[PDB]
Amino acid sequence: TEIRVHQGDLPNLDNYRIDAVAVDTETLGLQPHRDRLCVVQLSSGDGTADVIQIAKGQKSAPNLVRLLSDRDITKIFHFGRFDLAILAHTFGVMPDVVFCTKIASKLTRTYTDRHGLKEICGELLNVNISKQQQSSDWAAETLSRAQIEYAASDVLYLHRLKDIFEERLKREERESVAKACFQFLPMRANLDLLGWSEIDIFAHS
Amino acid sequence: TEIRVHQGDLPNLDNYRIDAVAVDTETLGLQPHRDRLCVVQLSSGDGTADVIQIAKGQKSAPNLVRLLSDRDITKIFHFGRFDLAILAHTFGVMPDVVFCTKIASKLTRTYTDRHGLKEICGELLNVNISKQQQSSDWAAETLSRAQIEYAASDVLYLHRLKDIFEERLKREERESVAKACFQFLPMRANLDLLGWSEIDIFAHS
Amino acid sequence: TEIRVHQGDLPNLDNYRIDAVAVDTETLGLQPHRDRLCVVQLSSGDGTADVIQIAKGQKSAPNLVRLLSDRDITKIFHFGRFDLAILAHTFGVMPDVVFCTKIASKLTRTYTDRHGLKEICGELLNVNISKQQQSSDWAAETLSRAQIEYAASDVLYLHRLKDIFEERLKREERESVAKACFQFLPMRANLDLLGWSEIDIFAHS
Amino acid sequence: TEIRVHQGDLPNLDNYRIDAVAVDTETLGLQPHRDRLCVVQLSSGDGTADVIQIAKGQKSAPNLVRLLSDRDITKIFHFGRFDLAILAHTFGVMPDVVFCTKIASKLTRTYTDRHGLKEICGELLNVNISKQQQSSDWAAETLSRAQIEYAASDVLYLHRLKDIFEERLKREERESVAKACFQFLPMRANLDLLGWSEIDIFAHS
Amino acid sequence: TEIRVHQGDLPNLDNYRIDAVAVDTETLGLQPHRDRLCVVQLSSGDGTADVIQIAKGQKSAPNLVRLLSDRDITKIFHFGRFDLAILAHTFGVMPDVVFCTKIASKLTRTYTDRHGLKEICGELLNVNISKQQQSSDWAAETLSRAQIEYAASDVLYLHRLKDIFEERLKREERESVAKACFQFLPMRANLDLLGWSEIDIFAHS
Amino acid sequence: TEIRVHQGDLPNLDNYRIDAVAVDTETLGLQPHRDRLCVVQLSSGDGTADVIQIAKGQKSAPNLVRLLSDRDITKIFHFGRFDLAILAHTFGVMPDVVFCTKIASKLTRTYTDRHGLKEICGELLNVNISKQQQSSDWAAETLSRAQIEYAASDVLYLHRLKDIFEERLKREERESVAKACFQFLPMRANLDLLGWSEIDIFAHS
Amino acid sequence: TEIRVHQGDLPNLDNYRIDAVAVDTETLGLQPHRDRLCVVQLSSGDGTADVIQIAKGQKSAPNLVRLLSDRDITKIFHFGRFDLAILAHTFGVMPDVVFCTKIASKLTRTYTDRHGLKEICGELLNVNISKQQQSSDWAAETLSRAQIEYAASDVLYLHRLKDIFEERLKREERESVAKACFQFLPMRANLDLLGWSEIDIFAHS
Amino acid sequence: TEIRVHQGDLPNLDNYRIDAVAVDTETLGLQPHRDRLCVVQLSSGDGTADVIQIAKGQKSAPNLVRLLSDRDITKIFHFGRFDLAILAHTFGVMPDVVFCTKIASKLTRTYTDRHGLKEICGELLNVNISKQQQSSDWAAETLSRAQIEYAASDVLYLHRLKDIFEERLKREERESVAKACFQFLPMRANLDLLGWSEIDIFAHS
């Protein structure tokens, strides 16, 4: 698999004149106010991925942010609630046309309680993603080959999953439910940034 | 307080040519598939309320449902997640222009964890609502005077609360957050009806 | 209220030529193998009750047991699961025609989670039963007047509750459900005696 | 093992002129109101099984339902509480002559807390059933061979288990307990359908 | 009530030529290695009590310790597990002839789960002990009158309770059980001092 | 009690040429990044208090901050962990000479688990502080008299408590422990601001 | 390993003229009132064991009970709390000279929380006992060879463990603690039989 | 790896004229008042370690304690909270210049919740430490070779970890936070010895 690694930003958008882009991030942790964005991964849905190393304190990534802002391109995430939050916190732009494979899984794979990406990829595509056990320093100046391949594996399959989940949503007649959930997801991420990250805002208590 | 009690439906909408109506319901319990709708309460925001007794098996209430469907009239609820669900389950129409005082409380009264209607009314209006201790059979053919007065007390103050909460949302710059939450709330209620009532669809686990 | 106190057994069944008898017990505790039966209370549903003091080691009560065995007389309990167990353990006869006001409450009073006798009597009859706070030695040779009146208060109202609950079960169309639950209740009590008292035999886990 | 796969219904009952039939189901999930019935499995207790694919929205299966309604044929389930519920919800007929291997296990295998079918089959028959790890889409138009073999494995052994459990129940003198539990089990399933699925109706709290 | 307050020790044992003495302590807290003994209370079972203030660092109290060591005198405690530990830690002598009203309560008052001294005194003697709400500095050089009266109230009734509990233990045939528990109690307290205070040494896990 | 209310800052430090000042704050909630500082209260330890209303977005309070920065003046807090965090977040200055009455209580009042200010004031001074039940909008442009008196009551007694706690710490020989805890407390508050507010940094897990 | 299997009782005590005998039991479960004794295992501490099959309803085993009653022979158990209870319930004789390897482990192996027999044997003797995974019907008329070998493995090592634990108890100066615990253990088992099996009789709550 | 084993103390400090020494301990358990110190391990950071066996009741180790007291030498621990406590309890000297790799991990490895030494060594150095499964008697007169090698493995890598953690702390600008935590750590250990081992002294509750 060809994986192109960049520092700071894409050189151009020549590879991303497409209707949907798979997006994932890596960070120093789960708390956007403390743990900085370190890597952004992109895929056109083909056998190739782009891995963009983000520098400490970097405030701008014009080509990437241009992609994130383009309303004609659906951004595909797995658990986009986090990625949307960290992207908006880092670059100041909240994507508003999104698809999340975890929400889709929760709306269609009702026969299981395991909705992680590994199980979804195994069941839906019979593709085995091997997830590294040890954790690592994603802020390292030079990423290892194993890190680069792991980071790319998280975006290589989101297009195929989106196609299958759209088929399942049509079959079970939940398309409008999913559309409304995806439409609200950016606001849920913003609520996380504003300080309600531990609160289900719709719960009775 | 004048409380007009009706069977089945409003006689007409002469008292409800207004921009916002306060709405509440009473039922036989928390599970819409098992526990039928028994009472609907309405208020124009003046010192009067309408209390509509709903018959067992009643499928239609044309004047009430006409009010619920009118997109030019905001329906004010406290914890509308439930009322929207039971109304849609009973009459087949989901309101789509709503305001919920509990979400507004969670977005503005950040200095407390008590968001029930009694505490909100006490703090914001210095009005003491006394909530009956014993529970009762809301399906009784004839409601008692105490029941009627209790049922009316749940709608008499929602307009004043909405005004105050709108002031607080403007002050703390959370108007667009609240608008998005209210816009999603009917879908959250529909999700409850479809079988996800115990699931936070946006949670990681 | 006339309360007749007896030692060991009823003198005869002259007061119990009726279709249903209210029954309750008092013991030294919740574990029938350790905590002996001390008092049995009976009512014809009129303003009078019979309170029968049971001696330590007593194995027989022929008139009482004759009443308990009579299939033409429904025995009314509140939470009969316990009373049936202790009666069968003490006298060797398991009643098989029973009505339980707690099961009926759980099948009809779906708008509350409080199913104790005090709350039921308060809501359904507006009768205030005052339940003694201190506990006492029901094995005392001579019961106090306060003890006798408290013991009688537990049977004085079960007939009126049964009538109301039967009305509610008919209204909500749950008569056959209740009948099947009451038909199984003696076996549930026997299961308690055999060693499954802490196990829901129908649960998945 | 010969496994015959059918769409909608058995062609006839020529293979089921027997005293007991093993029954299992597969669905889209644990909630009968949301998750439709997808597969029904049957066995005569011989080395063969029938696997019936049920179509979306299918309301009738006359030969299967005729079998389910025949009071002279005992239906053997493992955890029939669920299967009875989904069968009654889908086809409108509640079987009333049943045997459940999980209740029997809880009444006889008192030396363990593991009552799943795999452990029971391993202990009682020394037969290793391998249970697929990944979950799958039982609503797929064409089931895979692995799915068909897995589905059949759930009914192939219930007759042998019933014979052994009947021996154990006789040995430990619990036959009447089991008979009463099996007699009540269809009502427990109906209670699940009516809205008490999360409630132990016999518990004190 | 006459309460004699002493510093360090009894002047003599003229008032304690008796078969049983009621004993209680007060300390700076629940951890004997950190929280020093501040007060010791004694009663002959008559209407009078002795309250002995213990100085910081005091290692000896010859008359008191002589009383504690006398095998012909039963020491009555309520929850002696603690008092025995703190007494042995402070003065180096573990009493070995003891009676504990809490163990006796747990062995006889099987109809309740509330075994504190206030509830026991209320039920068994109809005597109301009022327990101060605020806590206080028992190490103060001069105890207040309210403190002295509260401290005395903890020993004034233990003789009457012991008499009643002995009657109950005889009635329910648990005398040898209680005797063995009381015989082991000093070792349980020693185990607490040695480092097993949070461990039930007889539990499976 | 004279309570002087100011907007933004003290006019001068003429009343605060002293060795120790009692400090408390009020905010819109428990999360400094979301919930702004609304009120600061100060006391010289005399019968008077200063209540300073802080404006939204206010970044500077030179006289107050001069007081907070003066190393010759001990700042007395109750649960200073929070107040230090919100003060440093709002004005950018972390006090480094502090005394906390809650840590002192935990180090000396070892005979209780209730360390709130109300219980401490009740026990140590026999002064009854009445804490308002309803919560309120501390960001209101004009505070009510009840709010002002409540806010002042939180600082009026900290000097007397500090004197008593210093006596207790000397008596129990814990002065160096307390000094080290107070010396570390500002870093604990900074850790809260940096993102470890839910983590005990010294715990094993 | 020679394992002699008997029905009902030892033929004689020719092999048990010794100072200590290792004892274990097997039953149908953890509840002595429901789950009958099925097997008793004995060892002289040599490489041989005796396995005695106990018949249903058997009330007497004179040679075995003679051994159990002999005060000159210490009975070694692992978790004797259970075995003592089931032996006394079945044959009516409570041994009163016992040693328990689990209590000894809890008193000496303070560096671990795993006190099961497998871990103890592994650590102290470097002997690997393999514990069967599947459970089985110990009431079977004929035990399998695997069952017999497993049952014997539970007694073959208790003598060696007792020797090591006695060395450890002497080294850490806990001999009198252990002696008192072992002296109380039969009463703890009796308390289990009387109805306090779920209660720590010495706990504060 | 050369591991030198000593009884009681180092012969001299010829190998420890260095700026930092890695320190670890082994004991009989987690409670310093009950469980004695058995082994002390030291390393200069080279490929060699010193393992010092401590005798029961040993009160002095002049060369070791001289090393522990030398303010010019940083003592490196992993979870020094425990080691500092046991060292101070045993020899009476509390080190006051320390570095803890667990606190450093919690301050830098924010992308994981696993902070044990094995995971840290695996991630940061790609060195596999194999941790024995069975526990053992560290008080044995003669330690086994496996024990000696295991004990040495706990100190061989702390220097390399300290270097990496110092790099990470500089990179993420947390040096002053770590310095303050390390400065407070000896007082936290002393608090453990004084009786607050189960209390987070800085928590609100």
CB F149 within 8 A of CB F51: no
Residues of chain E contacting residue F109, judged by C-beta atoms under 8 Å apart:
135
Burial bucket for residue A97 (CB in 10 Å: 0-12, 13-18, 19+): middle
Nearest to B190 by CA among B180, B201, B178: B201
CB C95 within 8 A of CB C71: no
Q: Which residue has the tokens 């057994």?
A: C9
CB B117 within 8 A of CB B22: no
Nearest-neighbour CA in chain C from B14: distance (Å): 34
Residues 6 or more apart whose CB falls under 8 angstroms from that of H116 comprise none
Reading the block at residue A39, the tokens are 């890597």
Q: Which among D137, D138, D150 is the top mutation candidate for probing chain A, defined by the most A β-carbons within 10 Å of its own β-carbon?
A: D137
Q: How far is residue H92's CA from residue H52's CA, in Å, rounded to a whole number?
A: 18
For residues A125, A126, A132, A138, the Cα torsion angle rounded to the nearest 10 degrees is -10
Resolution of the coordinates in A?
3.1
Q: Is F150 annotated as a binding residue?
A: yes
Residues 6 or more apart whose CB falls under 8 angstroms from that of G13 comprise G63, G66, G67
CB D97 within 8 A of CB D74: yes
Per DSSP, A21 falls in state: E
Nearest-neighbour CA in chain E from C117: distance (Å): 19
Strand blocks (E) in D28-103: 37-43, 49-53, 74-77, 98-100
Q: Which among C111, C123, C124 is the top mutation candidate for probing chain B, defined by the most B β-carbons within 10 Å of its own β-carbon?
A: C111
Nearest to G1 by CA among G132, G165, G154: G154
CB E21 within 8 A of CB E42: yes
Which chains sit next to A, with 3 or more Cβ pairs under 8 A?
A: B, D, F, H
Please count the other Cβ atoms lying within 10 Å of the Cβ belonging to residue C126: 8
Question: What percent of chain D is helix, strand and coil (3-state, nearest 5)?
Answer: 40, 15, 45
Whether B134 sits inside 8 A of C123 (CB atoms) is: yes
Residues of chain F contacting residue B167, judged by C-beta atoms under 8 Å apart:
none
> By what method was this entry solved?
cryo-EM
Shortest CA distance from F201: residue in chain H? H103
Residues of chain H contacting residue G109, judged by C-beta atoms under 8 Å apart:
135
Shortest CA distance from A36: residue in chain H? H172
- Single-letter amino acid, residue H62: P
Please count the other Cβ atoms lying within 10 Å of the Cβ belonging to residue F88: 19
Q: Which residue has the tokens 């997109």?
A: B71
Q: What is the bridge-based pairing of β-strands C37-43 and C20-27?
A: antiparallel
- Single-letter amino acid, residue B54: I
CB G202 within 8 A of CB E202: no
Q: How far is residue D24's CA from residue D3's CA, in Å, rounded to a whole number?
A: 14
Cite the annotated binding site of H by residue number.
Answer: 24, 26-27, 78, 83, 102, 110, 113, 117, 131, 134, 150, 154, 204
Residues of chain A contacting residue D37, judged by C-beta atoms under 8 Å apart:
none
Q: How far is residue H89's CA from residue H75's CA, in Å, rounded to a whole number?
A: 17
Helix or strand holding residue E84 (H, E): helix E80-91
- Single-letter amino acid, residue D141: E
Domain extent, residue C44, equals: 1-205
Helix or strand holding residue C84 (H, E): helix C80-91
What is the 3-class SS of chain G, one letter each residue?
Answer: CCEEEEECCCCCCCCCCCCEEEEEEEECCCCCCCCCEEEEEEECCCCCEEEEECCCCCCCCHHHHHHHHCCCCEEEECCHHHHHHHHHHHHCCCCCCEEEHHHHHHHHCCCCCCCCHHHHHHHHHCCCCCCCCCCCCCCCCCCCHHHHHHHHHCCCCHHHHHHHHHHHHHHCCCHHHHHHHHHHHHHHHHHHHHHHCCCCCCCCC
Nearest to E100 by CA among E121, E124, E80: E80
Reading the block at residue B142, the tokens are 């004839």
Q: Which residue has the tokens 């079918």?
A: D117
3-state secondary structure of B93: coil
> What is the end-to-end Cα distance of chain H in Å, rounded?
48
Residues of chain E contacting residue F119, judged by C-beta atoms under 8 Å apart:
134
The packing angle between helices F175-191 and F80-91, to 10°, is 40
Reading the block at residue E33, the tokens are 């290695």
Nearest-neighbour CA in chain H from G110: distance (Å): 6
Whether F194 sits inside 8 A of A34 (CB atoms) is: yes
Q: How far is residue A27's CA from residue A130's CA, in Å, rounded to a whole number?
A: 20
CB H15 within 8 A of CB H50: yes
- Single-letter amino acid, residue B197: S
3-state secondary structure of A194: helix
Q: Is G72 annotated as a binding residue?
A: no
For residues G6, D105, D76, D167, the Cα torsion angle rounded to the nearest 10 degrees is 20
Residues 6 or more apart whose CB falls under 8 angstroms from that of C127 comprise C121, C157
Residues 6 or more apart whose CB falls under 8 angstroms from that of A165 comprise A101, A104, A105, A108
Shortest CA distance from G119: residue in chain H? H134
Total beta-carbon pairs less than 8 A apart between chain A and chain B? 50
Nearest to B157 by CA among B15, B79, B44, B16: B44
Q: How far is residue A27's CA from residue A90's CA, in Å, rounded to a whole number?
A: 11
Reading the block at residue D159, the tokens are 């007759």
Whether C110 sits inside 8 A of B136 (CB atoms) is: no
Q: How far is residue F177's CA from residue D105's CA, in Å, rounded to a whole number?
A: 60
Q: How far is residue E75's CA from residue E68's CA, in Å, rounded to a whole number?
A: 7
Whether C201 sits inside 8 A of D181 (CB atoms) is: yes
Q: Is A159 annotated as a binding residue?
A: no
Length of chain F counted residue by residue? 205
* Chain D residues within 8 Å of chain A (Cβ atoms): 27-29, 31, 34-35, 134-139
3-state secondary structure of E55: coil
Residues of chain E contacting residue G201, judged by C-beta atoms under 8 Å apart:
103, 106-107, 181
CB A138 within 8 A of CB A35: no
* Chain C residues within 8 Å of chain E (Cβ atoms): 27-29, 31, 34-35, 134-139
Say how many domains are in chain D. Answer: 1
Whether H110 sits inside 8 A of A136 (CB atoms) is: no
* Chain E residues within 8 Å of chain H (Cβ atoms): 31, 33-35, 194-195
Per DSSP, E32 falls in state: T
Q: Which among D111, D119, D173 is the top mutation candidate for probing chain G, defined by the most G β-carbons within 10 Å of its own β-carbon?
A: D111
Q: How far is residue C22's CA from residue H176's CA, in Å, rounded to a whole number?
A: 76
Please count the other Cβ atoms lying within 10 Å of the Cβ belonging to residue C168: 19
CB F5 within 8 A of CB F148: yes
Nearest to C134 by CA among C114, C119, C121, C150: C150
The packing angle between helices B80-91 and B175-191, to 10°, is 40
Nearest-neighbour CA in chain G from H189: distance (Å): 20
CB H69 within 8 A of CB H16: no
Strand blocks (E) in chain E: 3-7, 20-27, 37-43, 49-53, 74-77, 98-100
Burial bucket for residue D5 (CB in 10 Å: 0-12, 13-18, 19+): middle
Question: What percent of chain H is helix, strand and coil (3-state, nearest 5)?
Answer: 40, 15, 45
Nearest to A98 by CA among A14, A189, A194: A189
Nearest to H37 by CA among G111, E89, G114: G111
Q: How far is residue F17's CA from residue F73's CA, in Å, rounded to a whole number?
A: 9
Q: Which residue has the tokens 């220097």?
A: H159
Residues of chain H contacting residue A35, judged by C-beta atoms under 8 Å apart:
110-111
Residues of chain H contacting residue G122, judged by C-beta atoms under 8 Å apart:
134
Q: Which residue has the tokens 């005569």?
A: D44
Buried/exposed code over C148-163 (b: 16+ C-beta within 10 A; e: otherwise):
bbbbbbbbbbbbebbe
For residues B153, B157, B158, B163, the Cα torsion angle rounded to the nearest 10 degrees is 180
Which chains sit next to C, with 3 or more Cβ pairs under 8 A?
A: B, D, E, G
- Single-letter amino acid, residue C133: Q
Residues 6 or more apart whose CB falls under 8 angstroms from that of F167 comprise none
Whether H135 sits inside 8 A of G112 (CB atoms) is: yes
